[PDB]
DNA sequence: TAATACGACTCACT
DNA sequence: CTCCCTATAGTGAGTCGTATTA
């Protein structure tokens, strides 16, 4: 076993030379070299730029040194980070530091001092552990290896790519070991704060802000990134040209998946990987002997997909991104919004210096959002400018707790638009007409055109045939693309489409075309129940049209909304009804006839609906609706001028809501059904065994278990965790105290075990679903190349024929050979429930839908 | 000696 | 009372008592 059967030294030289082996020499000293990167920076590189980190580094590493002489000088208590901190290089200390940083600014939402700091901690724990390792195998690929030309030459440019080593060919010293941490919470908190703190010290890039000080709930402290620094990111050209994600693509084929960790990454001198990530050590420990051939085999053909980067899609992304007005919307804009100015009538203590208190509250929050949609941005660009002249480059893999599965490098093909846009398949085919008919599909479907059958979507193409043309002959003066539903992707189709017309039907295309499945989830309970009703509304069944569950949920709201204006509640009095005189308050309880009227003058929409009935399959019933539809529609439609129909809002969002989750509920009553059977288990499960006086306890609290149609086996255990809270003297300031999970769990937290069962169950059932249909498409058709985004699926033009059948049969196939309730059911019977036993029950009416008409549905990919 | 950093508690919160 | 997103996490000051170390 890896651990202790070799040498430091033998450890850091496995690595290379199977990677030399096979590859050559020059790549696999390359693919080290940037796993390396991860833990510091090449003083090669570095040198060589002589960008924001050639000042950066410097500074950070100088005041490192410089604090451990001030530590070492005085008497008394080393402070906790110290200790761990001393062992650690210094100039690896301020790499990780200023990384993990920008990295963790690529949030929008969460930068409290809590998470920043533990990410930090995280790294410099792994390069504390490693980086001995890390050290000779720097010091060994540097050596050039030992004879033979041909063998060095390795690569050979041979247009044949370089396929995946072979499991038996990995030496023992290569099957990793130990992807989970081993420090305290409290002391990687601490080791992250002193870090952060030195950052800002040496140099101003960032800077803790307090946010709303007094309120118990939201009270909290953040890392901002200091204006100056958000300025030279937005407005010079590579100011993060040396600063790269944590996880970056491989250069080589991936290292196959054969146990629980290590696979993916080849160095040795890294934290080596999971092959599931969960919230404990313990929580993996129980894959490892689990025996689970498909997933494995999943997970490594993905793994294994060629890419490279699309240089045409890239050429205008460099250029339009710095542009102080961009033809993509989504594109963060360069300028900050200056805050609303005050009224002049400040002192006015009406609801004006409240509403500015939120108007500029909305301002701040905006350009956080705007700041971090910006550094996201100029890493994915630092990373495709990087590999843009590669041959070829790959993507290792993870899967969540539940199954799904996730490329793991930061910039990847399952990101946004822009992402997605610069990266392609690395080996092609002759797109044919059959090949070509999809692209064309894939084009329509980038733009807005998806919801009209497809010989619409060739007419849409067909019609804009010179607009496209122009586009990709001229795509920064013709601009037609930019404002596309997807801008981007949309392009690199454009590019693509002219490539055809110049070289017709033998064009070789890799361009990835991409099959959506319609709401995932509502399919699968749809499947699994067979509810006929339900399916259509998604799209299992053969349509002449699509059928838009969004739209359909909304023209019953509609029904129920004239209805309720005909007929309904009167406005009822004030509350003071109840009692005599006191609270005149509540003078409204806006009748059912009202409320319909105003929502009516609202509108409502496909739009209304849509944002509150894919949180369906999270959790979110008939109460959480109203605080969506607040918030989503109504709120900002205040806050925007209209909604002056919405006198009393809470009241209107409250009746909003019931009339969703009604119409929801006799849409696609299956789907619901089913979600409360499995949040009665959970109930359950979860559930301690009392009684009367004897609170003994036969059964403890039990975790939720099932395995999945292809053999991955999942656990569900949430559980409530002990907090603390540390106290740091912060830049010789104040006290920074921060409230933080330990790594120290206590009892199972039975809400959030019956909120979170039917979420993740169907997840983690169509993420089987998507494994099953890799291996598939794989063995019966001759797919190798793969774009995987859960419940998107797609490839090369000349291979989406085949996939476009294989998603379609693939689920038929497992549905009517797995009854995944009933399975469920024998699970947590003899292993669950003890006495009582009952009152739960009752597995949901299959219905009368037909599996088989999936493979005639033509809008159900997926 | 007598400085040092910080866990533990406890309060009050524009 | 939206689930994963290799997740996540109320705050600072006033006071005390401890094991450390130059």
């Given at each position: 076993?890896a651990?202790?059967?070799?040498?430091?030294?033998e450890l850091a030289a496995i690595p290379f030379n199977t990677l030399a082996d096979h590859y050559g020499e020059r790549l696999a000293r390359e693919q080290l070299a940037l796993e390396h990167e991860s833990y510091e920076?090449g003083?090669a590189r570095?040198?060589?730029?002589?960008?924001?980190?050639?000042?950066?580094?410097?500074?950070?590493?100088?005041?490192?040194?410089?604090?451990?002489?001030?530590?070492?000088?005085?008497?008394?208590?080393?402070?906790?980070?110290?200790?761990?901190?001393?062992?650690?290089?210094?100039?690896?200390?301020?790499?990780?530091?200023?990384?993990?940083?920008?990295?963790?600014?690529?949030?929008?939402?969460?930068?409290?001092?809590?998470?920043?700091?533990?990410?930090?901690?995280?790294?410099?724990?792994?390069?504390?552990?490693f980086?001995?390792i890390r050290?000779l195998e720097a010091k060994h690929f540097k050596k050039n290896v030992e004879?033979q030309l041909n063998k060095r030459v390795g690569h050979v440019y041979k247009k044949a790519f370089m396929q995946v080593v072979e499991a038996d060919m990995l030496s023992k010293g290569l099957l990793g070991?130990?992807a989970?941490?081993?420090?305290?919470?409290?002391?990687?908190?601490?080791?992250?704060?002193?870090?952060?703190?030195?950052?800002?010290?040496?140099?101003?890039?960032?800077?803790?802000?307090?946010?709303?000080?007094?309120?118990?709930?939201?009270?909290?402290?953040?890392?901002?990134?200091?204006?100056?620094?958000?300025?030279?990111?937005?407005?010079?050209?590579?100011?993060?040209?040396?600063?790269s994600p944590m996880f970056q693509p491989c250069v080589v084929p991936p290292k196959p998946w054969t146990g629980?960790t290590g696979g993916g990454y080849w160095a040795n001198g890294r934290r080596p990987l999971?092959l599931?990530?969960?919230?404990?050590?313990?929580?993996?420990?129980?894959?490892?002997?689990?025996?689970?051939?498909?997933?494995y085999k999943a997970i490594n053909i993905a793994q294994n997909t060629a890419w490279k980067i699309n240089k045409?899609?890239?050429?205008?992304?460099?250029?339009?991104?710095?542009?102080?007005?961009?033809?993509?919307?989504?594109?963060?804009?360069?300028?900050?919004?200056?805050?609303?100015?005050?009224?002049?009538?400040?002192?006015?203590?009406?609801?004006?210096?409240?509403?500015?208190?939120?108007?500029?509250?909305?301002?701040?929050?905006?350009?956080?959002?705007?700041?971090?949609?910006?550094?996201?941005?100029?890493?994915?660009?630092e990373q495709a400018n990087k590999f843009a002249n590669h041959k070829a480059i790959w993507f290792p893999y993870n899967?969540?707790?539940?199954?799904?599965v996730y490329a793991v490098s930061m910039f990847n093909p399952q990101?946004?638009?822009?992402?997605?846009?610069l990266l392609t398949l690395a080996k092609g085919?002759?797109?044919?007409?059959?090949?070509?008919?999809?692209?064309?599909?894939?084009?329509?479907?980038?733009?807005?055109?998806?919801?009209?059958?497809?010989?619409?979507?060739?007419?849409?193409?067909?019609?804009?045939?010179?607009?496209?043309?122009?586009?990709?002959?001229?795509?920064?003066?013709?601009?037609?693309?930019?404002?596309?539903?997807?801008?981007?992707?949309?392009?690199?189709?454009?590019?693509?489409?002219?490539?055809?017309?110049?070289?017709?039907?033998?064009?070789?295309?890799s361009?990835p075309?991409?099959?959506?499945?319609?709401?995932?989830?509502?399919?699968?309970?749809?499947?699994?129940?067979?509810?006929?009703?339900?399916?259509?509304?998604?799209?299992?069944?053969?349509?002449?049209?699509?059928?838009?569950?969004?739209?359909?949920?909304?023209?019953?709201?509609?029904?129920?909304?004239?209805?309720?204006?005909?007929?309904?509640?009167?406005?009822?009095?004030?509350?003071?009804?109840?009692?005599?005189?006191?609270?005149?308050?509540?003078?409204?309880?806006?009748?059912?006839?009202?409320?319909?009227?105003?929502?009516?003058?609202?509108?409502?929409?496909?739009?209304?609906?849509?944002?509150?009935?894919?949180?369906?399959?999270?959790?979110?019933?008939?109460?959480?609706?109203?605080?969506?539809?607040?918030?989503?529609?109504?709120?900002?439609?205040?806050?925007?001028?209209?909604?002056?129909?919405?006198?009393?809002?809470?009241?209107?969002?409250?009746?909003?809501?019931?009339?969703?989750?009604?119409?929801?509920?006799?849409?696609?009553?299956?789907?619901?059904?089913?979600?409360?059977?499995?949040?009665?288990?959970?109930?359950?499960?979860?559930?301690?065994?009392?009684?009367?006086?004897?609170?003994?306890?036969?059964?403890?609290?039990?975790?939720?278990?099932?395995?999945?149609?292809?053999?991955?086996?999942?656990?569900?255990?949430?559980?409530?965790?002990?907090?603390?809270?540390?106290?740091?003297?912060?830049?010789?300031?104040?006290?920074?105290?921060?409230?933080?999970?330990?790594?120290?769990?206590?009892?199972?937290?039975?809400?959030?075990?019956?909120?979170?069962?039917?979420?993740?169950?169907?997840?983690?059932?169509?993420?089987?679903?998507?494994?099953?249909?890799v291996?598939?498409?794989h063995?019966?058709?001759?797919?190798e190349s793969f774009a995987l985004?859960?419940?998107?699926?797609?490839?090369?033009?000349?291979?989406?024929?085949?996939?476009?059948?294989?998603?379609?049969?693939?689920?038929?196939?497992?549905?009517?050979?797995?009854?995944?309730?009933?399975?469920?059911?024998?699970?947590?019977?003899?292993?669950?429930?003890?006495?009582?036993?009952?009152?739960?029950?009752?597995?949901?009416?299959?219905?009368?839908?037909?599996?088989?008409?999936?493979?005639?549905?033509?809008?159900?990919?997926?």
């Amino acid at each position: 076993i890896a651990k202790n059967d070799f040498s430091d030294i033998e450890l850091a030289a496995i690595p290379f030379n199977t990677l030399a082996d096979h590859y050559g020499e020059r790549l696999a000293r390359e693919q080290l070299a940037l796993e390396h990167e991860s833990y510091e920076m090449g003083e090669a590189r570095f040198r060589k730029m002589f960008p924001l980190i050639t000042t950066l580094l410097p500074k950070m590493i100088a005041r490192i040194n410089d604090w451990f002489e001030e530590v070492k000088a005085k008497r008394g208590k080393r402070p906790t980070a110290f200790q761990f901190l001393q062992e650690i290089k210094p100039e690896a200390v301020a790499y990780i530091t200023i990384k993990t940083t920008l990295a963790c600014l690529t949030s929008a939402d969460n930068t409290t001092v809590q998470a920043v700091a533990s990410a930090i901690g995280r790294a410099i724990e792994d390069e504390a552990r490693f980086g001995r390792i890390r050290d000779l195998e720097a010091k060994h690929f540097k050596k050039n290896v030992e004879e033979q030309l041909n063998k060095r030459v390795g690569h050979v440019y041979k247009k044949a790519f370089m396929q995946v080593v072979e499991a038996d060919m990995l030496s023992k010293g290569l099957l990793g070991g130990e992807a989970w941490s081993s420090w305290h919470k409290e002391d990687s908190i601490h080791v992250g704060v002193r870090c952060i703190e030195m950052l800002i010290e040496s140099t101003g890039m960032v800077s803790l802000h307090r946010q709303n000080a007094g309120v118990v709930g939201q009270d909290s402290e953040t890392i901002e990134l200091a204006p100056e620094y958000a300025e030279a990111i937005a407005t010079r050209a590579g100011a993060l040209a040396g600063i790269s994600p944590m996880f970056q693509p491989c250069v080589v084929p991936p290292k196959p998946w054969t146990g629980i960790t290590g696979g993916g990454y080849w160095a040795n001198g890294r934290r080596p990987l999971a092959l599931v990530r969960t919230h404990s050590k313990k929580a993996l420990m129980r894959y490892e002997d689990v025996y689970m051939p498909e997933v494995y085999k999943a997970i490594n053909i993905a793994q294994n997909t060629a890419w490279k980067i699309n240089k045409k899609v890239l050429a205008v992304a460099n250029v339009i991104t710095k542009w102080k007005h961009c033809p993509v919307e989504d594109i963060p804009a360069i300028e900050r919004e200056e805050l609303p100015m005050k009224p002049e009538d400040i002192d006015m203590n009406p609801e004006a210096l409240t509403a500015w208190k939120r108007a500029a509250a909305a301002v701040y929050r905006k350009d956080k959002a705007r700041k971090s949609r910006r550094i996201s941005l100029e890493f994915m660009l630092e990373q495709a400018n990087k590999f843009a002249n590669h041959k070829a480059i790959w993507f290792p893999y993870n899967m969540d707790w539940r199954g799904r599965v996730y490329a793991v490098s930061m910039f990847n093909p399952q990101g946004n638009d822009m992402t997605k846009g610069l990266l392609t398949l690395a080996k092609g085919k002759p797109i044919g007409k059959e090949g070509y008919y999809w692209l064309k599909i894939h084009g329509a479907n980038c733009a807005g055109v998806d919801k009209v059958p497809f010989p619409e979507r060739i007419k849409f193409i067909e019609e804009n045939h010179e607009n496209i043309m122009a586009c990709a002959k001229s795509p920064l003066e013709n601009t037609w693309w930019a404002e596309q539903d997807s801008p981007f992707c949309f392009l690199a189709f454009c590019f693509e489409y002219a490539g055809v017309q110049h070289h017709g039907l033998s064009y070789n295309c890799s361009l990835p075309l991409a099959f959506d499945g319609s709401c995932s989830g509502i399919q699968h309970f749809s499947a699994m129940l067979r509810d006929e009703v339900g399916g259509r509304a998604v799209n299992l069944l053969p349509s002449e049209t699509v059928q838009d569950i969004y739209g359909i949920v909304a023209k019953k709201v509609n029904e129920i909304l004239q209805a309720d204006a005909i007929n309904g509640t009167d406005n009822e009095v004030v509350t003071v009804t109840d009692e005599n005189t006191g609270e005149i308050s509540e003078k409204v309880k806006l009748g059912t006839k009202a409320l319909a009227g105003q929502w009516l003058a609202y509108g409502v929409t496909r739009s209304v609906t849509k944002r509150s009935v894919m949180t369906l399959a999270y959790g979110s019933k008939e109460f959480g609706f109203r605080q969506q539809v607040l918030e989503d529609t109504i709120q900002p439609a205040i806050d925007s001028g209209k909604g002056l129909m919405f006198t009393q809002p809470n009241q209107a969002a409250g009746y909003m809501a019931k009339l969703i989750w009604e119409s929801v509920s006799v849409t696609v009553v299956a789907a619901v059904e089913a979600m409360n059977w499995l949040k009665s288990a959970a109930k359950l499960l979860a559930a301690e065994v009392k009684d009367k006086k004897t609170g003994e306890i036969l059964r403890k609290r039990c975790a939720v278990h099932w395995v999945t149609p292809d053999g991955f086996p999942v656990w569900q255990e949430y559980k409530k965790p002990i907090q603390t809270r540390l106290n740091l003297m912060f830049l010789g300031q104040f006290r920074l105290q921060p409230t933080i999970n330990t790594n120290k769990d206590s009892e199972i937290d039975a809400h959030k075990q019956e909120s979170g069962i039917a979420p993740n169950f169907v997840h983690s059932q169509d993420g089987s679903h998507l494994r099953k249909t890799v291996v598939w498409a794989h063995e019966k058709y001759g797919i190798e190349s793969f774009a995987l985004i859960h419940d998107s699926f797609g490839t090369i033009p000349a291979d989406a024929a085949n996939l476009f059948k294989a998603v379609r049969e693939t689920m038929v196939d497992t549905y009517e050979s797995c009854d995944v309730l009933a399975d469920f059911y024998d699970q947590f019977a003899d292993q669950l429930h003890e006495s009582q036993l009952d009152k739960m029950p009752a597995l949901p009416a299959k219905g009368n839908l037909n599996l088989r008409d999936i493979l005639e549905s033509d809008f159900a990919f997926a």
